[PDB]
Design a protein around this ligand. Structure first.
Ligand SMILES: Nc1ncnc2c1ncn2[C@@H]1O[C@H](COP(=O)(O)OP(=O)(O)OP(=O)(O)O)[C@@H](O)[C@H]1O
Ligand SMILES: [Mg+2]
Lengths: 284, 342, 117, 52, 52, 86, 86, 117
């Protein structure tokens, strides 16, 4: 206490408020750039999914393991997590949703396997004893598809090897600048999602060399691309959450200054009084 | 209530066999506390070695104010005859209050916080009686009866600070008079760290010159371990984000700090402190888990006391240090860390 | 009187554990105040969640305070309280809401109060 | 069989370790027994030699 | 490799068994010494109190 | 404080509440009546119960339950009644 | 604060700028002349009319700078100009 | 008295250079803590190495502290102080390990001490 301590604390908290306001600005710009990069992904996935429309669930059928709803003995999850803190509750809400559903699954006796994107989930599930089979980390704010090839490759190789029976991606969904929602959504076996080619019965392709060889790589690339889309949306959601969290923290600091300055003024006055009564009642 | 009295009375108990006579002079304490600490000095062997001077809170101000001089005059009987003594003024911050009362009743012009002017010169000429006198002054004083021995009187005044504030009148004087400070912190005392000595602002101008050279060797590394820990500590609340190259330091700091905790009325010989610091300095604790450090320490101190007693005897008796001693210590730690358990 | 040689090891150790938790909780209130509870480590969230229970369980209703609050007073024996605090600290009542502990007698009135919300 | 030896050895060491850890507890308690006996027989003696 | 591996397999029982023996043979001396030193203290304390 | 120490209670009127149109701005939680219900008519005592601790709890609950909330239906009815009361 | 209340302005000399090598370390924003341009020769009143607040803003913009690489060049022009004039 | 007109430009520039190096190393400590060393640039790792070597080289053994440490004291002329710090900042002695500079005295004693380490 004493004026010269409380003024030092007020100074340090004002500095903290500078820091958090700068971080809010930075995050608010990075969110825009990240959602531009989020809308530069739709064409590839959408056209490729239209293609898989015609080739697979067309009037013509084909015998791919990744379109048939075989039996569930164990399930895989691709987990997207930030590489950086200060994100608000994002990661933990997501991990709690995941843990609740993975509990519901293991209550039928099925095992589960995790592939981790981002280091925060890596640490969390190393602590909670999850079954992490592969991971990639340090992508930061520059996610790239080439880095994702590893873990999704592992999960696919395990799926077609029979070792998995269903595959999920768990990630945040950027909806509004002010609201993002965690979602667990399936990507193997491929969902049934309209895209009817009954209209396109007018034509069929020249397949070089054959449709099955293509359909294989089509589906593999498509899964890779949906994982990438998920990573990029989660990145934009992280930026939005950091923006709102730093906003809240700047207003908290701004109120703590109001408290500290009342304490400071009280100490200022008490010190003046006690100095002056010590002088005056000294004389005589 | 942070252990100021406990620290001084363990300092007194530990002299129960060291040749140093001890004097404990109590200013303004309530009698049923003096009786309690005397009952504890009697439990352990220390009472037969020490003098107690009492000025209870009910005694007039003149006695409370003169008691420290009456104690110093009883330590000087030993100093001036070639022996060693230790004197512990409990609460100079109550001698100062008694002297303020006496001054204000004599109508002397008051200073700051209403303390009289010469309250520095009050403590200055008390503490500067704590001295070591060379053998020639002894021979001159004892008129040739004692030769070649140097007397010594050691003082450990105690002060009490309101709300940790060290910028008040009496604290800021006695901090200027003395040779060092042991700052006891109430936060460290709550968090479990006992004794609560704050290493980052405690000092001792005598320093290593007063240690046994084994301790002088080994503690230098503890200073730096704790200094690096105190520079890094700010990140402990973001620790998960840190890099292992610093996480190593930030955990070694916590382990050495958990090592310096100690129970009351349990003093350690120099052999045991040296051994236990060597253990942490040479990385043996790098893998023991934080919550077990104390049981590790206890087991080690027990093991060595039966299976290597002659080395303890040597160290305690001479305090020396050699590559030979270092090898023996490394051997003891190696055998312990494998062939026993905590 | 709070010495192992007087109150016995278990009581002393429980008291010092409670103090350690509440102090560690004080050391976090500034970061919690600024940045909110979400920036804490996953083990600090547990320290906070246990301290906020210990604080309530230190509450008690008094026979002379029925005038103010209606609720009937309670008398808690020592043996019956060092057990409750040892429990909360050891995390075996770590599945019960905070308001389950507020203004109750022994730890068994808390486990009951939880059932009724 | 390498790891038969390995594992059985590790757990066998741990059992020796626990057996020591419980050989110690009886020791601590017996101390308390005999030392409090000495305390009782000390007070009960003092408080009648002095009365005499 | 059969000889080289089965050597360790046949030896580590002997060795780790001897060390599990050793741990306990220390702990036993610890118990015995404590039951001795509690006797030493039993005499020392009572003598102190009678002198008092 | 000198006078809080002489009287038999206090009615603490808080300016934050008063600016929010809550008038009279009686802050429950600080205000108390050291004679308690002994002074009330039996009907009033019956109806009121420990209501003031109910509003103290509601008002501190609103301290955490603005940016997020948990147990979010029973806390929801707690908040609903506290709000309609105030 | 007695004297600040007596005089017609102040030139506040800032230690941080002085140590950093900005000599004279005049601090804009917090320093001010209350007679204003009435005292300033015409050419200087023309050429200097912007400098003061432009620098007052640059000094906070360059304080935001350090926590942000990858600056919008609509602001990088500003952070260059302010540094020129400083 | 620390301005070019009185100390000479050589001295003034060497002093301001030491200040610049250390003032940058202060910036970099808190990157190294969060990210570890390896994420720095080439010149950032090099600024760090020279900053640590300068920070070491400012230590010295005293003829009067000779009684606390046993090590004999050293007297370093101003020519040699400037020559040493300028040599370190230019990168002439980048090939010595840090501890060659601690408590070394003159700069030649650094190139000598580096042998025995
Ligand atoms: N090393 C320790 N470990 C555990 N407890 C301790 C230790 N040292 C002291 N204490 C406890 O701290 C409490 C306060 O001790 P003590 O009275 O010595 O402090 P103090 O500063 O003298 O307080 P006061 O100023 O009121 O005399 C004591 O009950 C003691 O049991
Ligand atoms: Mg005391």
């Amino acid at each position: 206490a004493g004026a010269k301590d409380i003024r030092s604390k007020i100074a340090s908290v004002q500095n903290t408020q500078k820091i958090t306001k700068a971080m809010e600005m930075v995050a608010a710009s990075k969110m825009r750039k990240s959602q531009d990069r989020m809308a530069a992904s739709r064409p590839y996935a959408e056209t490729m999914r239209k293609v898989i429309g015609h080739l697979a669930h067309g009037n013509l059928e084909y015998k791919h393991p990744y379109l048939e709803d075989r039996d569930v003995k164990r399930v895989g999850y691709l987990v997207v997590s930030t590489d950086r803190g200060l994100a608000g509750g994002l990661n933990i809400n997501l991990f709690k949703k995941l843990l609740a559903e993975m509990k519901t699954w293991t209550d039928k006796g099925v095992q589960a396997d995790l592939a981790m994107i981002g280091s925060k989930g890596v640490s969390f599930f190393n602590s909670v004893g999850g079954n992490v089979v592969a991971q990639v980390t340090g992508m930061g704010d520059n996610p790239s598809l080439s880095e994702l090839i590893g873990p999704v490759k592992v999960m696919l190789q395990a799926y077609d090897e029979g070792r998995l029976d269903k595959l999920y991606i768990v990630s945040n969904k950027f909806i509004n600048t002010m609201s993002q929602v965690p979602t667990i959504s399936q990507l193997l076996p491929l969902p049934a999602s309209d895209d009817d080619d009954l209209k396109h019965k007018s034509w069929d392709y020249l397949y070089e060399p054959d449709p099955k060889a293509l359909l294989d790589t089509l589906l593999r690339r498509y899964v890779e691309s949906q994982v990438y889309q998920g990573v990029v949306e989660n990145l934009a959601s992280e930026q939005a959450a950091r923006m709102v969290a730093m906003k809240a923290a700047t207003d908290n600091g701004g109120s703590l200054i109001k408290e500290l300055q009342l304490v400071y003024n009280k100490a200022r006055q008490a010190s003046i009084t006690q100095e002056l009564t010590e002088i005056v009642s000294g004389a005589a | 209530q942070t252990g100021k009295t406990a620290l001084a009375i363990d300092a007194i108990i530990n002299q129960r066999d060291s040749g140093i006579k001890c004097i404990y002079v109590a200013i303004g304490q309530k009698a049923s506390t003096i009786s309690n600490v005397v009952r504890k000095l009697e439990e352990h062997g220390a009472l037969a070695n020490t003098i107690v001077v009492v000025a209870t809170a009910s005694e007039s101000a003149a006695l409370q104010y003169l008691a420290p001089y009456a104690g110093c005059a009883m330590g000087e009987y030993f100093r001036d005859r070639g022996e060693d003594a230790l004197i512990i003024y409990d609460d100079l911050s109550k001698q100062a209050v008694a002297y303020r009362q006496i001054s204000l009743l004599l109508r002397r012009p008051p200073g700051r916080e209403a303390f009289p002017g010469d309250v520095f010169y009050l403590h200055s000429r008390l503490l500067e009686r704590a001295a070591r006198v060379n053998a020639e002054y002894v021979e001159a004083f004892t008129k040739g009866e004692v030769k070649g021995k140097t007397g010594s009187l050691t003082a450990l005044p105690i002060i009490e600070t309101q709300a940790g504030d060290v910028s008040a009148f009496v604290p800021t004087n006695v901090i200027s008079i003395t040779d060092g400070q042991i700052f006891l912190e109430t936060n460290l005392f709550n968090a479990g760290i006992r004794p609560a000595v704050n290493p980052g602002i405690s000092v001792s101008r005598v320093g290593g010159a007063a240690q046994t050279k084994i301790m002088k060797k080994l503690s230098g590394g503890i200073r730096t371990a704790l200094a690096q820990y105190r520079e890094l500590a700010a990140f402990s609340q973001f620790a998960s984000d840190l890099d292992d190259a610093t996480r190593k330091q930030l955990d070694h700091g916590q382990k050495v700090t958990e090592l310096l905790k100690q129970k009351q009325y349990a003093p350690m010989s120099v052999a045991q402190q040296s051994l236990v610091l060597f253990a942490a300095e040479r990385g043996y604790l790098a893998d023991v888990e934080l919550s077990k450090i104390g049981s590790f320490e206890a087991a080690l101190l027990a093991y060595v006391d039966r299976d290597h007693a002659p080395l303890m005897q040597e160290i305690n008796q001479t305090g020396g240090y050699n590559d030979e001693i270092e090898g023996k210590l490394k051997g003891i730690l190696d055998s312990f860390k494998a062939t026993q358990s905590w | 009187q709070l010495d192992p040689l007087v109150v016995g090891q278990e009581h002393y150790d429980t008291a010092r554990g409670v103090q350690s938790i509440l102090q560690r909780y004080q050391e976090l209130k500034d970061i919690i105040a600024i940045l909110g509870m979400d920036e804490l480590s996953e083990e600090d969230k547990l320290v906070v969640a246990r301290a906020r229970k210990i604080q309530r369980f230190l509450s008690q209703p008094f026979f002379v305070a029925e005038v103010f609050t209606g609720s009937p007073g309670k008398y808690v024996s020592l043996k019956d309280t060092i057990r409750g605090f040892k429990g909360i600290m050891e995390g075996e009542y770590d599945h019960l809401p905070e308001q389950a502990f507020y203004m109750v007698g022994s730890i068994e009135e808390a486990v009951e109060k939880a059932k009724k919300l | 069989d390498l790891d038969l030896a390995k594992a059985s050895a590790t757990d066998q060491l741990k059992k020796a370790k626990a057996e020591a850890q419980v050989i110690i507890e009886q020791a601590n308690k017996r101390r308390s027994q005999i030392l409090d006996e000495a305390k009782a027989e000390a007070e009960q003696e003092r408080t009648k030699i002095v009365a005499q």
